Amino acid sequence: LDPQIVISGSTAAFLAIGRFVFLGYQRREANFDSTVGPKTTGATYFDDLQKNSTIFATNDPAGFNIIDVAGWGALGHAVGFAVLAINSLQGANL
Amino acid sequence: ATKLFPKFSQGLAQDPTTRRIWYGLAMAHDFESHDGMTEENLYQKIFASHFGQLSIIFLWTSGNLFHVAWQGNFEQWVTDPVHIRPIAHAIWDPHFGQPAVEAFTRGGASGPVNISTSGVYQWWYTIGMRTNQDLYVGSVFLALVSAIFLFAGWLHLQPNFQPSLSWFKDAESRLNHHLSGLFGVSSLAWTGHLVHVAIPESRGQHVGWDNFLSVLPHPQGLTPFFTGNWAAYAQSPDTASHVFGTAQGSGQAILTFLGGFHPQTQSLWLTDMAHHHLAIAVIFIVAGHMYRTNFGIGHRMQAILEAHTPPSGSLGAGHKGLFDTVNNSLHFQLGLALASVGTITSLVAQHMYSLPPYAFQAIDFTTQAALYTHHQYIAGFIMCGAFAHGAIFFIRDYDPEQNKGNVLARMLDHKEALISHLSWVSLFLGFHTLGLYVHNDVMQAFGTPEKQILIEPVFAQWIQAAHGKALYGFDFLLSSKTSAAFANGQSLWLPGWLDAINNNQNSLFLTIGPGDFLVHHAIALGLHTTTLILVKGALDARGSKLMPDKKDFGYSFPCDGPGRGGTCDISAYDAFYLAVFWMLNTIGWVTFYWHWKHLTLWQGNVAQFDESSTYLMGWLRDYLWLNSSQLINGYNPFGMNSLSVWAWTFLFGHLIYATGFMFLISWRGYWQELIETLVWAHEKTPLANLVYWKDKPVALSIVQARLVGLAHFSVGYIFTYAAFLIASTSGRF
Amino acid sequence: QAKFFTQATDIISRRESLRALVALSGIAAIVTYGLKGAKDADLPITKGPQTTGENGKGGSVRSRL
Amino acid sequence: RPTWLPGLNPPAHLKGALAGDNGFDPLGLGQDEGRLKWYAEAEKTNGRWAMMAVAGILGQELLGVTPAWWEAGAKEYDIPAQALTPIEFIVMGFLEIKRYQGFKQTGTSGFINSFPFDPAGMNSPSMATKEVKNGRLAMVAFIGFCVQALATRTQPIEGLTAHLADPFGKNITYYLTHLPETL
Amino acid sequence: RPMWYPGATAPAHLDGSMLGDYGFDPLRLGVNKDNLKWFREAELTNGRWAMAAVVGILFTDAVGLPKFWTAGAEKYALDNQTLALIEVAVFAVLEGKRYEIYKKTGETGFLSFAPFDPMGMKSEEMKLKELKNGRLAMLAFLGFCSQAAVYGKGPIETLQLHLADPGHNNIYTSSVGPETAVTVAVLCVLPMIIEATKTLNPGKESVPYFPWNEPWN
Amino acid sequence: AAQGYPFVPPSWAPSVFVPLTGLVLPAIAMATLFVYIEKEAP
Ligand code: CLA
Ligand code: CLA
Ligand code: CLA
Ligand code: CLA
Ligand SMILES: CCCCCCCCCCCCCCCC(=O)OC[C@H](COP(=O)(O)OC[C@@H](O)CO)OC(=O)CCCCCCCCCCCCCCC
Ligand SMILES: CC1=C(/C=C/C(C)=C/C=C/C(C)=C/C=C/C=C(C)/C=C/C=C(C)/C=C/C2=C(C)CCCC2(C)C)C(C)(C)CCC1
Ligand SMILES: CC1=C(/C=C/C(C)=C/C=C/C(C)=C/C=C/C=C(C)/C=C/C=C(C)/C=C/C2=C(C)CCCC2(C)C)C(C)(C)CCC1
Ligand SMILES: CC1=C(C/C=C(\C)CCC[C@H](C)CCC[C@H](C)CCCC(C)C)C(=O)c2ccccc2C1=O
Ligand code: SF4
């Protein structure tokens, strides 16, 4: 069953459809700074824990940082392990 | 003149009467009404009080553990749990006579003890605890955790550790961390405990901190996990010949989906619960990655809420402006939390009796009864508080301008429709339930029980048959051995589930009949009328036709005077106080039904309930009167037994209840004049006018009268029924 | 007599001293009552059951220990 | 400055003032300044204890001590642990209350009354960078020691020898599997 | 001045005005000044009696005499009730003169010499030495009784037992071992919590909410 | 305790702590929370 094949393929497919397919949609959706403004305008330490203290710059041209990577690879690992587990009991219901 | 005690109120500190003491006792935790209260200081004091509540909870658990270890029989109960009674703690009462020292010597103890109706023995035996040293160490650890939370509550009140107002109003991060870590990683760690400790200890293998790094939870350690061969963790489950706590019929699996019950313990499989918490942990961890934090991804709850505006304007503005309303109102959050927590407390009660999670539970009948009644009354109180705080929100926190046209304002817009329809459902259910019960009573009185209205609950029976109960012959979904729902589960939970649900000696989907129909409709009447009172106090909270400016008078206030026809019990607080009676009656019906159904099941006489629950003289004769015999004979002119304490507590609760009647019927104005006469008497009595009061005696206020009467009422209700329940279940079993 | 009783109370004639005496006396009294005085009074809770008690008679149906 | 991500600008609260600044505060934990000073001292203290700890584990393994570093507690010495622990609490409480009384004032490290301790004149910002970097390395190295010996598994140099004998057959992928063979 | 733990800050009432002041009043028992004077005198009285008792016990255990927890059971020239009556009668007048001397002087005296100081060695250095040796001897008698109750041996016999095997014959291997180990660890970590309180509230004092303290003022 | 588990309460513990918890600590508490209630503010 080659779990390396399965999980590498799931992660690669999800990273691909996150980079090439659903990146524009996710950027259109995640741009909430709108009526929906910042959580805090204050200068307290606890107001700073809610600000984006570190913008994750990426030299990827489409803007695919370690957070997009983390998310799409997490979905890929989850789906690959789902495939492996549903194959683990050598069958499915219907 | 000006006193010192109600530091949070200068108006109470300047009050020269006894009302100052009471109201400072009862306004202490209404932080918003405190003098000089800022919203930030409010949230910070709430945070500290939450730390204190956690510390108290962990100390209480530490004390339970400590007393079960020190004065309990846990090391003997694990040997013969079906036959040995669990000791709660020892009794040292110098008022005891020798007959009482002899009568309360139970459970193999050396002296007088209390028998645990708590279930903590079954719980701790199921999760791997076998010795008294385990419980001792757990109690020490939980006392340390309590001290740690106390220190945290002190610390986060200090200047450089007091969080900002916005840190509390950060909902996305709190939700992410509380779903992912507090719910999810906690469930993952509990799965780890079950896989490493509880399941091996149920297989007879001792796993503790001394050796848990040296024993494998599975013979194939973590290879099935990192290779995706997860079914290897379900290969050899525990057999049907398995005896809990031993290796005879052990099994090697740690994650199963067997379904049903462990046959020897009549409890859930520990591997099923491990897999349960693993699945739930994964689901909650991925759920806690939903909301937006400092990393650029995720949702903003404001966007989700403001986007969910239906077209057709069927909800108006929809959920526009609702994020601000929920996030800025602590009473909205508290009402939502109490609603959910009470609903899931009722879920706990309804599922722990049908699917007993703990070993040798469901054979400890007193424990089952006590747990169900406990969690259902807790749930009823919590659910009354949910609506109470919803009303407090509508009064204190609701801004009609910032909720212009959204679902929340759309509620108040058609509140008369809601209240009148709840009125219709309550009225219908009461009329017809009481009428059918009275018809059946009259028919049994005239000796013609074949003329009763015995409506078969075919809808709930159809549901039961959809779950695989083959007693009714519906043959629909899982009772149909040819359906796809049945076929697709046969490799899975369904064999165990269907062996467990068709066994009529457990409580998994009990057989129901017309008595169950009638009492379920009584339960519905109770729910509908309780929520009628509560919804009507929550929606008429900001004003009515009788009192349109009610929001200006607060949540609690005595009345608006005898003008405009009379305005007694006008406030939302009074609606809550009226709904607590109906809640207690609802949960009393619920727990009566539960206890009688299960008493007739445990006695092998289900026909008694099936034949006597269709009329209320059967409830009075065959449940309340029949089961009271051993209870009221706890002490008699011919001696006493261990039910003496429950007889005493029975009479105690009756007394408290009746005393509450004093504060509920008799109102302030008789007592103020009586107290004036007593004041005169004391000021004019020689040798006693030397002693004088510092706080002027006054009768209890109207709101305080209602509170104290409801408190005596509820405490008596609760103590009476707990005494009766334990004494009627512990007397037979 | 008045001198005797003004001097007997000389040490406890202040609130703090009297409450210290009361605390000392009451705590000592309850502690010696639990340790020694309850057994000296021959209390049934200090003697023990003197019997097998209600041990094996759990319920009328299930005679549990 | 070279930052932990290529092309990344370091956050605002992280100047190059402190020793080992590489712009690494993705959680933003050091955005308070007094807490950042306390966390700098905490980094230095955890790093010093981890440096001495990995030094002690490697000097226990390179030298001939009887048990593993993770079994040295379960060992009979001339003093029982029940009596060892309170002596250690006394001594280390003295030392740590003297260290803390000396971080309130002097805002710096030190031994008992010397803040900074520095008997030798080797103080330097480059030396502070080296301290914090070797301390981070030793912290990671001790968590390595612990997770690498999570059950009765290799000792540190034993594990390094095992990896150098057969690299593609003795690594984490072999040992997270074949765990029943180890226990 | 030195403190009871390094870098402690004394409370408001322990101004250093008194001798042996190390700022140790965590339960705030001495916030009243009359109570504080009475407690200084009681400290000194318990300390004097404990010094005499410590040297008496060390003497009686150094020579061939019965152990001090059994000496009351031995047989003497007078029956125990006559002894108790003579002791009560003597100490009534003795402690009455001492009580009058405290009400007048504020300090100690035997009967009529308000300061019992034939040899005029009443420095304040000597008052400090009295107080310190008295605290030490109070601890010493507490230890005498404690390690004669844990064992059935006297003070120097327990000392010899310790010196025979110091690592295994000590308080943490005794019947009271674990409780003392835990209380020692708690005591050693306690001052860091106290210094946290002093640090997070710079220069502020927190009332511990006790009865004797009148913490509402 | 001897060796089973340390910090086990003595046999006489209830006889002391039930009076303490029920007669003394409530007396202390009610006296203190009576002086504090009737205390006038300056
Ligand atoms: C998470 C739970 C939670 C939280 C945080 C709060 C918090 C609050 N509630 Mg809410 N509430 C809750 C649950 C909660 N409540 C539930 C479950 C109910 C329904 C029972 C209510 C019903 C409710 C009402 C009706 C009101 C509040 C009010 C308040 C506020 C102040 C209450 C006060 O001063 O306490 C003081 C409380 C007491 C002094 C306790 C009274 C005594 C009770 C009855 C227990 C007595 C037990 C007794 C000792 C047992 C004896 C047995 C023995 C003899 C054997 C505060 C914001 C009030 C408010 O906001 O006013 C605007 C208000 O009017 N709450
Ligand atoms: C046995 C006691 C009892 C009974 C019968 C009721 C009955 C009722 N309560 Mg509850 N209530 C009670 C105790 C009781 N209450 C207590 C102790 C309190 C605390 C103060 C409350 C507080 C309370 C509140 C706050 C609310 C109610 C409501 C209701 C009504 C709910 C609808 C319903 O069931 O209609 C069915 C009706 C009945 C069961 C009673 C009528 C009985 C028969 C069917 C009528 C005909 C009998 C006969 C022919 C009359 C002959 C008269 C003459 C010829 C002699 C109903 C009238 C709600 C309400 O009124 O809104 C709808 C509501 O909001 N009650
Ligand atoms: C069981 C319910 C109950 C109880 C106990 C009481 C009790 C009382 N009522 Mg009330 N009353 C009730 C129901 C009740 N009423 C109801 C339902 C109504 C209809 C509205 C009234 C209407 C009413 C009116 C109109 C009047 C009273 C009066 C009285 C008092 C007269 C008896 C008295 O003082 O004797 C002494 C006290 C008792 C007998 C109560 C029981 C106490 C026992 C002996 C236990 C003692 C406990 C002990 C101190 C231990 C303490 C424990 C410690 C930890 C706290 C007393 C306070 C009258 C009054 O106050 O004037 C005198 C009065 O005028 N009541
Ligand atoms: C200055 C007083 C003093 C001195 C010198 C000693 C000395 C001794 N005690 Mg004793 N002891 C004392 C006070 C003292 N104790 C007190 C107050 C208590 C009650 C808690 C006890 C209770 C006690 C028990 C139950 C046992 C000992 C034992 C011992 C011996 C081993 C050390 C040990 O583990 O105890 C450590 C003692 C404590 C943790 C109690 C607190 C001690 C305080 C902090 C004083 C510390 C010394 C002081 C700072 C400077 C010494 C001055 C000078 C003599 C150099 C040793 C001979 C053991 C023994 O006999 O083994 C054979 C034993 O089993 N002691
Ligand atoms: C180990 C056992 C548990 C110990 C717990 C702590 C003990 C507390 C000891 C208090 C010492 C005296 C306080 C000095 C008094 C003092 O400092 O006053 C402070 C405070 C009141 O302050 P005031 O306003 O009166 O002070 C003004 C004056 O100081 C003049 O300025 O005291 C109280 O509130 C009442 C406390 C009563 C405490 C005694 C209660 C008695 C308990 C015994 C009950 C026995 C019942 C059974 C009988 C058979
Ligand atoms: C250089 C470059 C490249 C490449 C790159 C790469 C290759 C990357 C990768 C990346 C990656 C490769 C990533 C990954 C990620 C991953 C992740 C993120 C994971 C996660 C996981 C998780 C989350 C898990 C979970 C879980 C568990 C733990 C167990 C079971 C259950 C579950 C599954 C749920 C190219 C050629 C294109 C070009 C451009 C540039
Ligand atoms: C007053 C107020 C308040 C409160 C309120 C409340 C308290 C409410 C409650 C509510 C509630 C308490 C609700 C409940 C609900 C429930 C539900 C909604 C359920 C559902 C269910 C379902 C949906 C199911 C499904 C299923 C079934 C049927 C079975 C099987 C499985 C499944 C899943 C298929 C607040 C604060 C908000 C504010 C405003 C005002
Ligand atoms: C009896 C009665 C009184 C008189 C009762 C008095 C004034 C209050 C009773 C106080 C005495 C001291 C008894 C208190 C006993 C409680 C056990 C005290 C517990 C409180 C602590 C928790 C603080 C009223 O003032 C009243 C007012 C309005 C409606 C109904 C009534 C009413 O029924
Ligand atoms: S005092 Fe009572 S009767 Fe009078 S208006 Fe108020 S609630 Fe109504």
UniProtKB/Swiss-Prot annotation, chain A:
UniProt key word tRNA-binding: no
Record's bilayer topology term: Multi-pass membrane protein
Any one of the GO BP annotations: photosynthesis
Taxonomic superkingdom: Eukaryota
Cellular component GO terms held in the UniProt record: chloroplast thylakoid membrane; photosystem I
Membrane-spanning parts: 5-25, 66-86
This protein's UniProt keywords: Chloroplast, Membrane, Photosynthesis, Photosystem I, Plastid, Thylakoid, Transit peptide, Transmembrane, Transmembrane helix
Cellular localisation: Plastid, Chloroplast thylakoid membrane
Family of this protein: Belongs to the PsaG/PsaK family.
Function: Not yet known.
Protein name, per record: Photosystem I reaction center subunit V, chloroplastic
Lineage, highest ranks first: Eukaryota, Viridiplantae, Chlorophyta, core chlorophytes, Chlorophyceae
Gene that this polypeptide is encoded by: PSAG
Portion held of the full protein: 32 to 125 of 126
Swiss-Prot record, chain B:
Transmembrane segment boundaries: 46-69, 135-158, 175-199, 273-291, 330-353, 369-395, 417-439, 517-535, 575-596, 643-665, 707-727
Membrane topology: Multi-pass membrane protein
EC number(s) stated in the UniProt entry for this protein: 1.97.1.12
Coiled coil: none
Binding residues for phylloquinone: 671
Resulting phenotype, residue 654 to C/G/N/S: Contains somewhat decreased amounts of PSI, depending on the strain; significantly changes the spin density of the P700+ cation radical
Variant or mutagenesis effect after changing residue 671 to F: Still able to photoaccumulate an electron on A1
Chain residues that bind chlorophyll a B3: 662, 670
Binding, [4Fe-4S] cluster: 559, 568
One Gene Ontology cellular component annotation held by this UniProt entry: photosystem I
Record's subcellular location: Plastid, Chloroplast thylakoid membrane
An annotated Gene Ontology molecular function: oxidoreductase activity
Cofactor binding: number and manner: P700 is a chlorophyll a/chlorophyll a' dimer, A0 is one or more chlorophyll a, A1 is one or both phylloquinones and FX is a shared 4Fe-4S iron-sulfur center.
GO biological process annotation, one example: photosynthesis
Free-text function comment from the UniProt entry: PsaA and PsaB bind P700, the primary electron donor of photosystem I (PSI), as well as the electron acceptors A0, A1 and FX. PSI is a plastocyanin/cytochrome c6-ferredoxin oxidoreductase, converting photonic excitation into a charge separation, which transfers an electron from the donor P700 chlorophyll pair to the spectroscopically characterized acceptors A0, A1, FX, FA and FB in turn. Oxidized P700 is reduced on the lumenal side of the thylakoid membrane by plastocyanin or cytochrome c6. Both potential cofactor branches in PSI seem to be active; however, electron transfer seems to proceed preferentially down the path including the phylloquinone bound by PsaA.
HAMAP family referenced in this protein's UniProt entry, alphabetically: PSI_PsaB
Family: Belongs to the PsaA/PsaB family.
UniProt subunit comment: The PsaA/B heterodimer binds the P700 chlorophyll special pair and subsequent electron acceptors. PSI consists of a core antenna complex that captures photons, and an electron transfer chain that converts photonic excitation into a charge separation. The eukaryotic PSI reaction center is composed of at least 11 subunits.
Protein known as: Photosystem I P700 chlorophyll a apoprotein A2
UniProtKB/Swiss-Prot annotation, chain C:
Membrane topology, from the record: Single-pass membrane protein
Transmembrane segments: 20-38
Ranges for region Disordered: 40-65
Subcellular location: Plastid, Chloroplast thylakoid membrane
GO cellular component, one term: chloroplast thylakoid membrane
GO biological process: photosynthesis
Keywords: Chloroplast, Membrane, Photosynthesis, Photosystem I, Plastid, Thylakoid, Transit peptide, Transmembrane, Transmembrane helix
Family that this chain belongs to: Belongs to the psaH family.
Biological function: Possible role could be the docking of the LHC I antenna complex to the core complex.
Protein name: Photosystem I reaction center subunit VI, chloroplastic
Organism whose genome encodes this protein: Chlamydomonas reinhardtii (Chlamydomonas smithii)
Protein encoded by which gene: PSAH
Full-protein positions shown: 66 to 130 of 130
